[PDB]
Amino acid sequence: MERKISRIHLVSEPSITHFLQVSWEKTLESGFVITLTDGHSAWTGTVSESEISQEADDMAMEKGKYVGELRKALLSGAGPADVYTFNFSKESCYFFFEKNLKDVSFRLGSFNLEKVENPAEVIRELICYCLDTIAENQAKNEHL
Amino acid sequence: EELEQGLLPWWLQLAENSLLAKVFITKQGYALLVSDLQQVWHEQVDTSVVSQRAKELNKRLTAPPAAFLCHLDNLATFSCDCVADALILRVRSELSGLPFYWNFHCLASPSLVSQHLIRSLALQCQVRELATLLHMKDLEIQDYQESGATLIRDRLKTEPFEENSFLEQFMIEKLPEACSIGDGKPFVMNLQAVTTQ
Amino acid sequence: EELEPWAWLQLAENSLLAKVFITKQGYALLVSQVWHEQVDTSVVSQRAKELNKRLTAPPAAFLCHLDNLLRPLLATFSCDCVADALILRVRSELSGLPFYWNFHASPSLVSQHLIRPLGMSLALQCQVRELATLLHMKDLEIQDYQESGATLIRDRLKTEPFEENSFLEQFKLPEACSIGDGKPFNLQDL
Amino acid sequence: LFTNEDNPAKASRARTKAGDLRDTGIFLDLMHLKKGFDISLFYRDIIS
């Protein structure tokens, strides 16, 4: 239910960023709620089961690596192992980040996101948690 | 059927039988040739059938046809979904990151593929080769016997024979070792597949 | 589909392997892929009698006369070979064959009789290897005769022991792509 | 005689000389020192 800070680097939108601040349930292999924000409009939504893996077969890659890669992309730190072009489309409210192997349009996950008005406080809390972790890590370094 | 007759070596072990995998996957399609020893089929491949199989074979399986086509071109249990006349064959291989959930809407055309695989003399050719290597070798054995008879390992010694002994009492109770058509006796051997060449 | 040695005829390299099983249910001829037929004995009797406009005889005489008498060992035959269909039914004398029977993806008998002999081919290669390794008893014997026996050598087949290298050297490459259709090795019943 | 495995030209002359000595009235005895009944190949005929 917590929000994990993942600033996916939008190659298509270098100006309007997008953070996949996932608010996940107690599940990883099934549909996990992934939440997104841009700076002036957040994209929340509930991911269903047996549909997120249809695009995984569209991706035509390994399962199990799918769950771990979803966790890596959703949580902090984009995974070097399977780099996806972070095309968080505002034109469709569908943050698709895809590894288009063999030069073909292959989709990764069915994320039903909706545009909202005021993500200001949510992004405030996001970066506040980031820098609170930074401050506690600094204090840990001091006493260490 | 041109993508199979003009497309044409092992022995894929399926759920209930072991069948030779005489399939040459290309960028234009792929048709698996399986000699089930029960039914003649027609393995056909098209972009539409690949697309539909990939998209709706399983609720969690959805892929474009070009995906399977190309990633097989770049290419461990096997499940059998057979109706005894229109086999929708399932080649569960390590493809697309999953067990390959695929539908071969099948064997191939009877005449040409029967000539290629089903329908030899080469075994009898080795029979004459062994006979020639044996034929006057017995004469050399009699020459040795006339010259002398000493032999350090005389325990391992017997008179010269002919292959007729094996043609009489070994061309029986030996071929029946692999004679029934069920799952299939190991067909991974018998490369010299002479009819295939 | 009642009873099901090998008998074969040379023409067009077709699947027409002229072996017929003596049976009361018509023809079990494998000159066909292989077709199959199941017909009542009586129906066969009056069918042959109707197709024979000169003499009516029980089918046993026809079977015993036409089993393996004329076709295998030794003027155009009645070959209506459309889709590999050998319809040899003409009510006349064709090389003295008084067999008049209206001849009509059928892999039952093909799989139990034709696909297996390419199933039942592994043991023949096994026996080939057995002959090869039996000839290697001769190898050690001749080696000891020529090394310690001090014997007289014919010097014709004083050859190194048989090997798979020698197997591929001898194997005959033009017949390494031999004609597998039904040709002997009639005698191909083994 | 004692040896773990059979070593063996040399083998032919060795077997011939062993047979000659056995003819002269000489008895032989040996077991391989690995243990089972596996290694007596080069001395199958040498021993009685």
DSSP string, A45-94: ----TTTHHHHHHHHT--SSHHHHHHHHHHSSS--STT--EEEEETTTTE
Tokens of A4: 């994990």
Contact, C79 vs B83, CB < 8 A? no
Residue B27, Cβ density class (10 Å: 0-12 exposed, 13-18 middle, ≥19 buried):
exposed
Written as one letter, the residue type at C49 is K
Nearest CA to C35 out of C119, C116, C107 is that of: C107
DSSP one-letter string for C11-70: STT-SB-------SSS----B---------HHHHHHHHHHH-SS----HHHHHHHHSSSS
Q: Which residue type occupies C80? A: D
In the DSSP assignment, the letter for residue D18 is H
Please give the Cα distance from A7 to D9 (Å, whole number): 80
CA dist., res. B123 & res. C127, Å (int): 9
Amino acid, single-letter form, for residue C18: A
- The pair of structure tokens assigned to C189 is 């019943």
Q: How far apart are CA A23 and CA A3, in angstroms?
A: 5
CA–CA gap between residue B85 and residue B42 (Å, rounded): 10
Q: Give Dmax over CA atoms of chain A in angstroms.
A: 52
The answer to whether A42 touches A29, Cβ cutoff 8 Å, is no
Q: Do chains A and D touch (3 or more CB pairs under 8 A)?
A: no
Q: φ, ψ for residue A86 (rounded to 5)? A: -75, 80
- How many Cα atoms occupy the beta-carbon half-sphere of C29 within 13 Å? 25
Distance between CA atoms of C171 and D44, rounded to whole angstroms? 36
Please give the DSSP secondary-structure letter assigned to residue C138.
H
Please, which experimental method was used? cryo-EM
- Per the CB < 8 A criterion, the answer to whether A85 and A11 are in contact is yes
Instruction: Tell me the C-alpha distance between B136 and D45, whole Å.
Output: 30
Question: C151 and B147 in contact by Cβ < 8 A?
Answer: yes
Distance of CA C12 to CAs C15, C102, C113, Å?
9, 22, 21
- The three-point CA angle C30-C182-C66 to 5° equals 45
- Distance, CA of C8 to CA of C113 (rounded, Å): 14
Neighbours of chain C (3+ CB pairs under 8 A): B, D
Whether residue D16 and residue B153 make contact (CB cut-off 8 A), yes or no, is no
Residue A97, classed as helix, strand or coil, is: strand
For an interface test with A, give the residue of B62, B70, B93, B94 to mutate (most A CBs within 10 A).
B62
Residue environment code for B137-147, b if the CB has 16+ CB neighbours within 10 A, otherwise e = beebbebbeee
* Partners of residue B50 in chain A, C-beta under 8 Å: none
Pairing relationship of beta strands B94-95 and B88-89 according to DSSP bridges: unpaired
**Does residue A2 contact residue A23 with C-beta atoms inside 8 Å?**
yes
Tokens of B150: 């000493």
Residue D15 to residue C116: CA distance in whole angstroms = 51
Bridge-based pairing state of the strands A42-44 and A114-115: antiparallel
Contacts of B37 (CB under 8 A, 6+ apart): B17, B181, B182, B184, C111, C115, C116, C119
* Pairwise CA distance, residues B26 & B68, whole Å: 11
Q: How many Cα neighbours within 13 Å face the side chain of A121? A: 3
Read off φ and ψ for residue D43, nearest 5 degrees: -120, 30
Q: For A89, phi and psi rounded to 5 degrees?
A: -75, 115
Number of C/D CB contacts below 8 angstroms equals 4
CB contact under 8 A, A60 and B63: yes
The tokens describing C106, both together, are: 């059928």
Q: Which residues contact A53 (CB under 8 A, 6 or more apart)?
A: A63, A66, B60
Chain D residue set in contact with C, beta carbons under 8 Å: 12, 16
Contact C14, C82 (CB under 8 A): no
Q: B71 vs A65: CB contact, 8 Å cut-off? A: no
Instruction: State how far the Cα of D15 lies from the Cα of B154, in Å rounded to an integer.
Output: 12
Task: Round to whole Å and give the CA distance between A35 and A31.
Answer: 13
Round to whole Å and give the CA distance between A51 and A60: 14
How far from chain centre, in Å, is Cα C69?
A: 15
Give the whole-angstrom CA distance, residue B74 versus residue B90. 20
- Which residues from chain C sit within 8 angstroms of residue D12, using beta carbons? 144, 147-148
B54·A65 Cβ contact <8 A: no
Q: Structure resolution in Å?
A: 4.3
B/e letters for C49-87, b = 16+ CB within 10 Å, e = fewer, are eeeeeeeeeebeebbeebeeeebbeeeeeeeeeeebebe
Residue holding tokens 């004679």?
B179
Cβ B155–D19 below 8 Å, yes or no?
no
A79, amino acid identity: G
Distance CA A111, CA A93 (A): 9
The gap from C-alpha B135 to its chain's centroid, in whole angstroms, comes to 33
Q: Tell me the three state secondary structure of residue C130.
A: helix
What one-letter code names the amino acid at B185? K
B130:C127 CB<8 A: no
Encoding tokens for residue A66? Answer: 């799918």
Q: How far is C159 from chain D (nearest CA, A)?
A: 19
C-chain residues near B140 (CB < 8 A)? 142, 153-154, 156-158
- Which tokens go with B158? 């017997």
C-alpha distances (whole Å) from C7 to each of A58, C31, C67, D4 are 56, 9, 10, 60
Amino acid, single-letter form, for residue B6: G
Per the DSSP assignment, residues forming a β-bridge with A8 are A18
Instruction: Please state the length of chain B.
Output: 197
Count CA within 13 A, CB hemisphere, residue A89: 11
Instruction: Mention every residue, 6+ apart, whose C-beta is less than 8 A from residue A37.
Output: A18, A19, A21, A43, A119, A122, A123, A126
Please provide the DSSP assignment of chain B as one string: -HHHHTT----EE-SS-EE------BTTB-------SS--------HHHHHHHHHHSBTTB---HHHHHHHHH----------SSS-EE----EETTEE----EE----HHHHIIIII--HHHHHHHHHHHHHHHTHHHHHHHHHHH----TTTTS------THHHHHHTSSSSGGGG---SS----S-----TTT-
Place of tokens 């003399």: B121
Residue environment code for C144-157, b if the CB has 16+ CB neighbours within 10 A, otherwise e? bbeebbebeeeeeb
Q: At what angle do helices C59-66 and C41-51 cross, to 10 degrees?
A: 80
Mapped onto helix, strand or coil, the DSSP state of residue A23 is strand
Report the alpha-carbon distance of residue C123 to residue A29 in Å, rounded. 52
- How many CB atoms are closer than 10 A to CB C121? 20
